Design a protein around this nucleic acid. Sequence first.
RNA 1: AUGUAUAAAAAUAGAGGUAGGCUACUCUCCUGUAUCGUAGAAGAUGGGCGAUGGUUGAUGAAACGGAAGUGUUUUAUUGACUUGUCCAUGAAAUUCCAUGAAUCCAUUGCAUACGACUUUA
RNA 2: GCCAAGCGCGACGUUGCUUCGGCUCUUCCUAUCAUACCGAAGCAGAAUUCGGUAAGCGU
RNA 3: CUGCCGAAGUUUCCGGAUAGCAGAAACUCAGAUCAGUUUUAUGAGUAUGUAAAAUGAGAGUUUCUAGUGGGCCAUUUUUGGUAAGCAGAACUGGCGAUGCGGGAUGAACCGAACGUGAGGUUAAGGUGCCGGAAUGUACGCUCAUCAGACGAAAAGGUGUUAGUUCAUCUAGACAGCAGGACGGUGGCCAUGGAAGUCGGAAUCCGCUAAGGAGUGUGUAA
RNA 4: GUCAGCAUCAGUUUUCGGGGGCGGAAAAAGAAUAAGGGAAGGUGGCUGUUUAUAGCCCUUGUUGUAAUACGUCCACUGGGGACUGAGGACUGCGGCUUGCCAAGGAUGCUGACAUAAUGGU
Lengths: 125, 168, 183, 196, 32, 215
Amino acid sequence: FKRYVEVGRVVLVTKGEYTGKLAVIVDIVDHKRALIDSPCSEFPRQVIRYGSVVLTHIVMKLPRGARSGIVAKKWKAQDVCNKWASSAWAKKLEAKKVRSQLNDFDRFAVMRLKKQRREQVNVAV
Amino acid sequence: ALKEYQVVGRKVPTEHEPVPKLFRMRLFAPNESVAKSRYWYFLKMINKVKKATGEIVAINEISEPKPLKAKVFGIWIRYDSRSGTHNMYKEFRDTTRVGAVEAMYADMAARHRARFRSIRILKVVEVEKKEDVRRNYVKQLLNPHLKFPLPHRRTKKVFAPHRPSTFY
Amino acid sequence: DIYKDETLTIPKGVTVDIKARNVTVTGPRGTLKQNLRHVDIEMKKQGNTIKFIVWHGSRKHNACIRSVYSIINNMIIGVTQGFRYKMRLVYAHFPININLTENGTVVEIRNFLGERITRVIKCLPGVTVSISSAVKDEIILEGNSLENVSQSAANIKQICNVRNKDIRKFLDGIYVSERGNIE
Amino acid sequence: SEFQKVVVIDAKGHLLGRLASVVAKQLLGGQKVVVVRCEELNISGHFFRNKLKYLAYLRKACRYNPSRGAFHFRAPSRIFQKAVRGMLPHKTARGQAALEHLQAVEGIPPPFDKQKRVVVPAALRVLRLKPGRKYCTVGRLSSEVGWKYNDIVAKLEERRKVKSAAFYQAKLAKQKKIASAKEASPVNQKLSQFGY
Amino acid sequence: VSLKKKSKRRTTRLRSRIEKKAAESKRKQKRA
Amino acid sequence: PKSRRSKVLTLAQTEKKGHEGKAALFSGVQQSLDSFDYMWIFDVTNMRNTYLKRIRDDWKRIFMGKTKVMAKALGHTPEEEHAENVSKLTKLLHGAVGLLFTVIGYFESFVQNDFARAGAVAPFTHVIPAGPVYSRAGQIPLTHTLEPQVRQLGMPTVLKNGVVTLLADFPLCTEGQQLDSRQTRLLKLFGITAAEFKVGLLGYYSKKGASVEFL
RNA sequence: AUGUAUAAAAAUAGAGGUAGGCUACUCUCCUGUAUCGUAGAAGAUGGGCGAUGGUUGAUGAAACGGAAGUGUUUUAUUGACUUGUCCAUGAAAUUCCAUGAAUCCAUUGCAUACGACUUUA
RNA sequence: GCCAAGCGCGACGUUGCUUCGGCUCUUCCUAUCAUACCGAAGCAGAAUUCGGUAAGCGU
RNA sequence: CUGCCGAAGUUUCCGGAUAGCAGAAACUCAGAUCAGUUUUAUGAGUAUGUAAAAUGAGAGUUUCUAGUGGGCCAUUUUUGGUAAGCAGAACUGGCGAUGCGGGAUGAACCGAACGUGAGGUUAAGGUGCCGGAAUGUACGCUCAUCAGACGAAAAGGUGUUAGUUCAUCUAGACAGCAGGACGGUGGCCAUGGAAGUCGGAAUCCGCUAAGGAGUGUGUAA
RNA sequence: GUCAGCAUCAGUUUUCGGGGGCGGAAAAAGAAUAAGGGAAGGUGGCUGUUUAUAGCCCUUGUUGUAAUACGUCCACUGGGGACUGAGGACUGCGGCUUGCCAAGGAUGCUGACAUAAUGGU
C-alpha cells in the first residue's frame, strides 16, 4: 500500500463546502472520523469523516495533536505547499479548475490556439 | 441532533415546604421541550414529584468545553429489553459528549433494537486516563502508532467510460 | 481488531513472488505455483520476511490468515526439502501386486483379496511413486506438494477398501506408515 | 448525465439486477442498449445458492403441454434479458418497444468489438459488494444448467483479446508519436494559461 | 426464485386470524 | 452459540492450592533458609520421584517449590534478601534446587543411573535387532505377551503370529545427536540408562562466614 | 439525426508503463468537467505570406476481418477544400420569438378420414 | 409423592402399581417393501437386524 | 331532468302507542338561555354526585306529519371458565345512507369525508425497476445448500456481535513441547483373576514441586 | 379574427442570494501572548524520564466589547420560475404632493398569421 491513515498525512477534501482544500490529519478520532487542520485561515480546524477526503501520498512529520499554530509552522517548514503542486495530480486539478472558470471569449481563443497547435501533425516518416 | 440540557426544577412552594429542594439533571434531547419532558419523567420516577406540583426553574444548553480535543466517554445506561431490566456500560471515542450519546443511541438501537423512550442514560463520564479504558477496540485507538488503510471506501453521470480505480 | 498479522521468514528459496496473490515459490528442488485469490489478505514482502495482513477482519476471515500461512510454509517446505510418504502394504492371504508406469505416476494394483479387477490410480502432478527395496511391500511417494502427495496416499488407500467384510477380522488394505521430508 | 443513441455496456464484473435495473430505465427513456459479455456477469451469493435458485425456476411446469409452461432459457444473455424483462411493462406496448431496444449477447461479436464499451458504476461488483462476500458468475451458472457454448465463447473471446491487444499497441505507439510531437509545437507552452 | 417450500406472504384471511391469535395471547395473559 | 474449544473436567479432586501453594512453597523456602546449616542448593534432576525420595531419605529436606520463586520471594536486593550478596547469587540460582539437612562425597562420587530423557545426547549408537524384538537387547538368560506394544510403539513392527516382528533394522539413537521424542520414548521401555544425576555444591550460606562460593 | 465523434486487457488487499537485467528503477492512476474535432452568405468571392501538411469526392488496386466477418488499413492517381498566418470584397427591409418456378387438372402408394406426404409426367 | 437448576411453583431425574366399500384409471408425496450406495452391532463367511442418502424404477 | 333538506338505525308501556331523531305551521324570546366540554366549590365514596367561572352558540317552547324500531365489527371493564377455543354482559366507537389517497389485490387497517375547474401544499404511504419520487447522508447488525423484507416454544447450534458477573495472570497468563505423576500399598473383602481402572466397602497415608487407596485406555491380572 | 413575444403592475405561489439587529457560558472553541500546574498514546535525549534538538494536557491573565455557529427579528434588500386578470363611468381607504400613485381585481408596446393558427367533430 501507499496511503495509510496516520497522524500527519495530507488529505484533499472532496465533500462539503471545503471541497478541493488541502488538510493534514492532526489526530485519529476513530475508524470513521478524524480531526484535521489546515494552515489557511479560511479552513478551520474541524473533525471530518474519512469518506469526505482522499488520502494523498504526501506525509509530513507532525507530532500528535498539534495546535493550529504548530501545524502551520510545520507545514511551512516542510513546504507541503508546492510539494503537492509538484505532483501531476495537482496540476491536472488546477488545469481543470482554470478551464471551468474560462469564459466564451477564452474558449474561442483556445480553439484557435489548439488548432494552431494541431496544424503541424508533422512526424518523421 | 441531540443537545445536552441542564434542567433544574423543584416543586411549587407550599406551607409545608416553603424552600423546596432544587434538583438538577444533565440530560440529552433534540429540543428543550423534550428535555423538560424527560426531566419530569426522571424526577417522578425517583422523587415521586408530580409535574403539576413542580415547576422548571432553569433550562440551559451545555456546549462542549473542548470540542476539538478527542476524548473517550463512558456511559452507564439502563437498557430496557424483553425482560425490561438490564444495565450496560459502553465506551465511545469522539470529541463531543453529544456525539458519544448520539453514537450510543444509534448503537443500542442497532445492536439491541432499543428505542429512545426505553433507554435512560444514567451517567456519562470522560475517561481521560488510557488505563481505565476497558474496551479493546478503544485501546487499539489509543495506541501511539495507529495507522491503517482506509476501509469501506467504495470510491448522476451514468455510463462511466473506464473502470473505477477503487485503489490508490 | 483493527490489525491482525502473521510474519514468516523465508529460506534460501529463490523466489516467493505473490503477484496477483499467486505464489510462485521457486526453490532449489523445484517450482510450485499456487493461487491465493480465495482469501482477501495483504501479502507484503520485505527482505526475508513475508507478512499476511488483515485489517478490520472478522473472526471468520481472520481464521484464513494462519491457514494461508500454513499452506505457504508447507509449499516452501516442498520446494526445499519436499515431502515423502511411506505406505506399507498389509495383506494376509492374497499378495497385492503393484506395478509402476511412467516413473510411477500411475499405480496398478492387482490380486487384492483375490479380486480380478485391476485398480488403476493416477497420482496428482508432481508426485512420483517408487518401491523401496529397504523394506518389503513398501511404497514411497515423494513430491513437492504436500497436498498432492497426501491426496495420492488418500486415493490409493480409499481404492483398496474392504467392503461387506468384518474389518475387525479382515485386516487387508494399504495404509500410510510414515509422513516426512526427503531430507 | 448525457445519452448516446446506441450504448454498448461491458457486463463483465457487473451485477445482474443492478445492471438490469439501470438498463431497464434507460430502455424506457428511449435509448438503445447493447450488453456484451453477458457470460461474465456476477450475482451476489455463492454458486450453490444461485444454482438452487435456477433449479427452482426450472421446476415450474404444467401437466398440459409443458410448451404452455414457462420457457426456461439457459444462455447468460437470456438470463439477463429475463431480469430486464421483469423490470419493464412488457404486457404494455410501451414496454414491448422498450424490449426491442435491448440486445444482450455473449461475448463481443464483430459489429461491437470495434466499438467503445462503457460500464455502469452503479452495478459494478467491486463498488457494491463487501469484500469477502460470495458471488457467482452467470457463465458458470449457465454452463451448469444446460448452456452448451461456454467453451466456444471462451475460445472466441481469447482470439478477440489478442486482436484487441494488437490494435491497442498500434494505437499506443501512434499516441506516443503525437505525444512526443505535442511539446514540439511551442504554442502549448506559450498560452498554457487557459489550462490546456 | 425463492427456494422456500411455502409462500412467505400469507393470505389476508391468514394474517387476519394472526391478529386473532394475538388476541388469544392477550386473553391467555390478561384474563385466562 | 460460539466457536470455542471445550474444557474437560475430572473428579480426581486433587487440585492444588495454586497461589496458596506458591505461598506455602515460599514459606518453606524461608524456613529452609532459616534452617541450621548446609545451605544446600539441590532438589532433583531427570530422576524420578522414587530416586528423589531415596536421596532425601538420608537427610533429617530437599525442597524446590518453583524456580526463581524463592529468589523473588527473598528479593534480589540485599536489603530484601535474608542472606548477603544475594544480588549476584540470584542470577546463579536457577533450576530445581533447595536446602537439605542430613553427603558431599556421595554427591561428588555416587551418581545412580536412571532412565534418560529428551534434550540430552546419547553416549553411543544403540541398534534395534531385526525380526523379533528384545526387551533387554538380548540380555535375558523377551516375553512374547507384549502384544499391545506393537500398536503403542509406532515403529515398523508387523504383528505376525502374535509376535512383534521388525521388517528392517532401525537404530534407537545415534551418538552426537540429541534424543528425540520417539528415541526417548523407545529408550524408556528399553534398558538405556544414559543418565547420571549430579549435584550443585558451589557455595554455602554460613551464618558467620556468609561466603557463597561460585566455584 | 443535429459532432448520430471516441474499440487494450486484467486487477481492485493494484495495475500500467518508461528506463533496465523472471529480479532490481523511478514515474503515472485518484474516472470522460477527458481526448479528437469545432471561425467561414449550412458556411459566399478573390488576393497574398508560410507550410508541404490535413480533410475528403470519383477511379485503380492489393493485404486484413467468419461470432452476426458488411467493415479495417496500406495505398497509385484524379477532382476539390483548407482557418496554418494575414488581407480585401459580399451579407441586410427576414428592420423584436415562431421551423424461372410452383399449384390445380392427371400419376403413383413407400402415404392417406379429408388436406397433406412420396413418386411420375 | 421424593428430590428439584431456578423463578409458592419448580424442569430433567426418582418412587409408587397399573348409505360405506372396493374395481379400474391417472398422476403426485416420501413418512422407502424391493433395487443402488453407505454407517453400526460378536458383523468369521453366508443369511440378517437396525440406521442414513434416495421416489430413478418397480410393488 | 335538475335542485334543496335529510334520518332512524330503539328506548319506555300494552303488533298499536308515547318518546327520540327530521321537517313544516303558528307563537315569545336577545339586561336569554343553552352545551355529548372543561374548571371552581361543597360534601361523600384516583373516580363519584351536587352547585357555581371558562369557551362556544341567539336561545326557547306548542301544535302535526312523515320515515325508523335492525344487525355486523372493534376497544375496554368484568363474569365464568377450557387440553385449546371461547361463552355472558356492559361501554362507546366503525360500517352502515359514503365516494376518494395508501395498504400489490380486499366489508371492516392507515389517511381523508365529495359542486365544476386552474395553481400551490400536504396526510397516510412511499423514492432500485415495474412506478411519480435520493442506487440520499450517517452509524451499526445480518450470509440462510429452504435468509429477510409479515402457534409449533420448551429449547438445541465448535454460528457471529456487543455486554454483565466471577476467576487466574513476570510468584510467568493459557496453549504447546521436556518430564515427574512416588513409598507404605497388590490398603480391606470378593474370584481362574481385578496389582488405581472384573467388581463390593474404605478412601488412609510419609515425602515433596506434585502425584488419586485413581482420569480413562489397557491387562487373563 | 386567431396565435404569439416582451414590458410595467395586481393576486396566489415557489426557488436562490445579500445586508443588519438581538439572544446564549452577553455561544463554546480558537488564535496570539504572559504566569503556574500536570503529564503522556515519552519527543530530543538516556526500558526508564518531564521540553530540551518534537510537542501535548489543565488553570489563570491578556489580546476583547475577538470571531463564528446556532436560535430569533428586520413595517432590510437583490434576483429566477409558474398560475391567475374576476370586475367595468365616478365615489373609498391611503401615499407622494391642483394633480400624480403599485391606493375598492391588466394594461401597454409590438409582431406574425389567415391561401393557418385556434377551436371543434
